[PDB]
Symmetry: D2
């Protein structure tokens, strides 16, 4: 494993502590053996998410301090509009308070627009993989979300350059089967979050967009981790070997008509989202009308002026290749520490998180007793580190049968915030997990002390078994 040095130094710190073992046991028992219920005060290194937990720069904080809080026509709104033109060549923006807000702005408008043409009678969206909130918004508006990620993504430990790719054969089949009139939009998610932060190649984006344009289908680039995707394109595609990151980004966005973005990810923010539309003014106008009742006025969209200011600066910083090399290299470093110690992971690592296959660590725990959660709980008890389950516990029950949905993989996700933790923190995570290797066989499954009907992973309370 190779450590890559920070292309920055620390300007402000935030104290974190490891509770004593007895405190960690007490806290975890108190949280019903569900770390989502732990107070942050009980957590040392927090790996639940890379969303909104990033460290900003001094320039971002300085931009916040001079932010224009005007209700209409904030100076930072116009800066953000200019930045979107400069990065993406897109002519229209609507800020949002975060990414799911940007989806709530754009997606119902896209459906309405296609319906007003007499189409979208049986409406669907097609994506390489819809993210959780993306699919939920699609389904809230009476549309089917179809996911057609490449079969490369399902071979967890076998390397491939582009595990986030669309399956082009499936794309064409689905267009032919549903009809182009019924495809409200194609959503290109970069990197592909549900494939584990795996990149989509430039040629895949290009071919998807060419097909869509031939059919008149609108394409949305879901852009939370677009810089990480651009880095992978430059690293792995020989055509972009000598291109700058902004050149890669510029080309990527030739292959969408609009973007939705959680700015809480690659733009290095704690809050914020963005809609940008390449040049369809009609859709922009419709989206502005939905922005008003749902988010705010069209020149702040539920964002303080200071956060638009931080976004302008963070959009810039998030494209910096030296930072991206270090950020993605830190994720790869953690994965390599685990992989070299025999811990099975999704490989190669994506831009923002390492996925550990817990089914192989604790074979004795069946899926319906949540083996990845057992590993996560053990990890927390051992170290104060809080990870998140991507397995049976998260997948929930099948609403028709009331029984556990069979999970393809039982993943523990180690989600890495940007510019927050050092490689010594990475070693701490890796060493604590490696150090459980004699304990894995003894670990016990989990049962429900209390279960919600929906979204159970957030608030359910568990109890160990036997």
């Amino acid at each position: 494993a190779k450590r890559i040095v920070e292309p920055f130094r620390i300007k402000m710190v935030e104290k974190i502590r490891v509770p004593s073992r007895e405190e960690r046991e007490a806290a975890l028992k108190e949280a019903g053996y569900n770390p989502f219920l732990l107070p942050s005060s009980a957590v040392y290194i927090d790996l639940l998410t890379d969303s909104g937990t990033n460290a900003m720069s001094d320039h971002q904080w300085a931009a916040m301090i001079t932010g224009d809080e005007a209700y209409a026509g904030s100076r930072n709104y116009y800066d953000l509009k200019d930045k979107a033109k400069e990065l993406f060549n897109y002519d229209y923006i609507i800020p949002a308070h975060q990414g799911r807000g940007a989806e709530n702005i754009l997606f119902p408008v896209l459906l309405k627009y296609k319906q007003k043409e007499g189409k979208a009678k049986n409406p669907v969206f097609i994506s390489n993989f819809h993210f959780d909130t993306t699919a939920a918004h699609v389904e809230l508006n009476g549309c089917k979300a179809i996911n057609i990620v490449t079969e490369k993504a399902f071979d967890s430990e076998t390397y491939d350059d582009w595990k986030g790719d669309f399956d082009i054969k499936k794309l064409k089949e689905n267009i032919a089967q549903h009809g182009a009139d019924n495809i409200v939009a194609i959503v290109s998610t970069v990197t592909c979050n549900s494939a584990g932060g795996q990149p989509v190649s430039m040629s895949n984006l290009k071919e998807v967009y060419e097909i869509a344009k031939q059919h008149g289908i609108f394409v949305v680039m879901d852009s939370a981790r677009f810089c990480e995707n651009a880095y992978f394109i430059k690293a792995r595609d020989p055509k972009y070997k000598n291109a700058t990151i902004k050149e890669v980004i510029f080309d990527m966005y030739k292959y969408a008509d609009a973007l939705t973005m959680s700015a809480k990810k690659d733009p290095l923010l704690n809050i914020g989202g963005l809609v940008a539309i390449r040049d369809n003014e009609e859709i922009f106008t419709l989206a502005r009308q939905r922005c008003v009742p749902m988010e705010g006025f069209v020149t702040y969209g539920g964002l303080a002026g200071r956060d638009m200011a931080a976004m302008v600066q963070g959009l810039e910083e998030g494209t910096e290749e030296e930072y991206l090399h270090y950020r993605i290299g830190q994720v790869k470093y953690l994965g390599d520490r685990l992989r070299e110690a025999g811990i099975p992971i999704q490989y190669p690592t994506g831009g923002h998180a390492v996925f550990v296959d817990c089914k192989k660590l604790v074979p004795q725990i069946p899926g319906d007793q949540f083996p990845a959660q057992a590993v996560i709980n053990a990890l927390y008890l051992e170290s104060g580190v809080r990870a998140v389950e991507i397995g049976s516990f998260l997948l929930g029950r099948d609403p028709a049968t009331g029984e556990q949905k069979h999970a393809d993989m039982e993943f523990m996700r180690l989600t890495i915030a940007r510019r927050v933790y050092t490689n010594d923190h990475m070693d701490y995570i890796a060493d604590a997990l490696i150090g459980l290797k004699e304990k894995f066989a003894t670990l016990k499954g989990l049962e429900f002390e209390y279960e919600p009907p929906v979204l159970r992973h957030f608030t359910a309370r568990l109890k160990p078994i036997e």
Copy 2:
């Protein structure tokens, strides 16, 4: 007119400038004679809104700096939960990104709650007066909004203590006409923003709640300006003459079951909202499931940790009687400057804005040519002050005729941000408006160069007539 000194001093300043007349000419023509389309760089004193434009304290900025950005279990979530229990005696909170986010969280849940017993076949909401966004969500969710404000409010220039009161007779008559089973909720807006930021008396709040509990009707307190309402209760109700402001607030919330709040008003913030529920855990649970797709995870709700931290502090500062006395007294001072010059206003002035009756200023301009907007535009051209229209331009067209819906009053709202402008800024505003008395007769109406089919006040491009 009486100037009340600030119970604080200035710690940080933000430069503002008066654009030249020709800059103001070109900007208003560029904005299509709609000041909502003006960039803030074209605006001297901005009176569009008191929402999110407030000046924070050093303690609020300090709280932001130490804010906990944890995705789950943020230290500031628990502080906020503790704060709502202290001020309102409510046991459950859900943060939101702002006020209309709070409404979008709670109101659909209230409809589902009443409906799940066979009720709400013809569902309605009853308020003293729904603000714009509140009534837009009510109607977005298939319900009708009913504004049963006291008719005292419609006698613009005649003093009354409680021009925001419910009309109790209209409340009882609406409950009989529609039936208790169709009334999803009663919404008590404090202060009553649409009535001119006019207070609701404690005895009115009590009688509404008692009437509502007779029929099993849930009561929500729209609480964006609750502190200004508490001040007016202490100022005008003999029972609370010796009460602290917090004691007044505590009593107010005995007469609701939950609250929605834009924290961008009285809690002195630039962003932020809040749902609090007194004790109905079931409605809290349903509300948390809607918060997730629309806003964020339930322990930050579309808000950075730093904004929850600022909200905890701002909630405290917003209750401070010396501050409220000064703030409301500034609004009163501006009103008195105009009223003493023969400029007709809503009297008494409310908590956050002065409302000028422009029907009496430009009689030669009829409603369908937007008299209050002609006055606003003249004020902007004369001085660089940007105000906002509460008249025929806002009201829009009727869904039946496609013609101009008749407006009761043609108001110009001079909305005052908290702790931002001095009484010398007030004098600038008053003197610019007073100096238009020689030019009112010359002004002309406004016609549409561009009119969007909905929300026209935000983006329509008007044009001077003749």
Copy 3:
């Protein structure tokens, strides 16, 4: 009296409170009836000084946040060097931690320089008026401080354009008497702080420098309030009616060889000082050598990087004419409030303070019983305002007879920080002092409970007589 509106609005506030009547009485008693011993918690409006209590802009705070803390070669040191070249045309800078630090750097070097070829056996400094620290450093280095302000300054209530001018007659007479080989330097204090912040004319500065240059005398511009002096030159000198403030400043510094500056005044800082030398590289070199042991290394001089950053921005903001017009107008406003009410003041008001002649308010209190302190104490008891004494209590005892040195006048100084207080704060001060007109007769003098042998005004404890 004319209120002048702020050319800015408030972005951050700082809470200040008026202690109750009983609280102020108890605090003043614990403070031994000396406001210099009051904790700030006991003070509402603080008028002790305009030094280091200014409100900064958002741009200044932003500059602090990105400040470069490098020990050597800070980006902000080069920015400050460039700024000094731009504003003053001076080629060399040495940052200092504040104004008296700048004097400690330069004045001993100037004396050693004058005592390096031949002899300055009776060394003296000559100023229109040495400020307290300036004269203290002069006397600490074995030199006499000679103050030769124009006699117009001593006609307290009669208007004059340039009450800060050098007496040209007394200058030529001092040079003839002491010889140009004993005059270590001439100090041009702009504005003349000890005269009451009164300006020095461009013609006066120029003639002083020409006289100094023909005698080979070095000229230092004491530049704490150099922008306020520039404002007064533009306002009152017809030659500069259409010059910019920066053009006025640029001309001022043609008439000195170096400057010492408290950046805690006109550059709008809370900490900071500066030495700048026009072109004498030898003086620069030796001054750098004293800087190292007394202040710090020469590229930060006892200042954090963020404070050099704030100083670069504040140097710019302090020259802005709209701000200077409001600032000096607010001081003039406080003085016109008192003058129109019969309270005697120095007229016209200087740039930064109002001076009240207290010997006329309490004639029954002789100089040796500190009548101006009795007015200050009464003012504090009535209002919580803290002012400072400039009279017999400050003047101290004559070290020979050990008795009260006769003070020519007894002043109370109402010193006004920059961008901190509103004109309503000014009214509050003025109305409190005016309201004491009926109590001025019954006021008692003060006597010593504890008196230090030196600097007694800072730590002495006083007791009301009778």
Copy 4:
């Protein structure tokens, strides 16, 4: 070599960059081959000093934002007085703008105090080792600075627990030789900066204090790195291995009568200093009278209120053992990386810096050609790292002969700021120096292009010989 993980995470970053090799060559040329003349923009990792370059916490920045800028009686002054009483049990404080400001306040007062006692006719100060500014102030006041560090300090590569100790026999000898009536003060420097940041044992501090008290000699603790010293006492003295760091600190200050402190070191600040006096009120009063003309009024001492606020917080944070173990462990890790690669260092490493013996690295370069500076310059040219010379260049010329003072050791100091650089930055430094092992013999000495008469290391320009 053992990497110790951070007991904090990153909340704000500051971009740094490695200039190209072409840029580093051009910059070093422009700086006359003196890294002290490089702009910070030419520097990647800056190792010039650990003074004032530390990263603060979010709690420290929050304290700055609410800091009280009052001229007299600042809230943060009383907090600072309380904090000194808590940590040191000292009753009196005088804030200073930094450590040499604190020395300028206290040392002249101590001399006058001993002289007024009819003594101090041939005055001296005795220290384990006076720091540069300390010895400068001692000599500026006509006294001799006598350094009597343990001979264990001069066996550079051989471990010893307490290389900062006083030589007790030399202390007793010097007291007799000069006479107690001539010893103005004994200065206990903790850690002993000039011995390399090496600790002084508790028993040494105690014995030195008891000896001083037997002779009536005042003892000052020079306290810039008192927490690092307390850590070493806890780490190495079995008496204290169960004490808290604050218990160790509390015991240390039983063995002094006053302290001077650069708060730019262990209290984790970018600016600030402190005098504290244990109980001698007379010395406190005299030091206050010197504070006023030299630093500022006695309740801010040339510090903004925000910096007294940051100091209160940093004094607490600087005592935290988890932090100290990481900080000192990171310095140790850098030293172990070098030592394990055969690079000769002072061993054990001190609290704040690694010292590399460059005499062993470039034996072909004589001392008066500055071998350590050649290694430093080569390190910069290869890496962008800027280190500082502690050898013949710094040592300067002998006043009596004008020749190069012979240097016992030719050290390169790698000075490590607190909480700024990660262990990956340490690896970068070590790997760059280790990659020079094949270039050391080819390195050539330096000669003067420009040499100032004093303090030449700051400003002299050098040139490679041939």
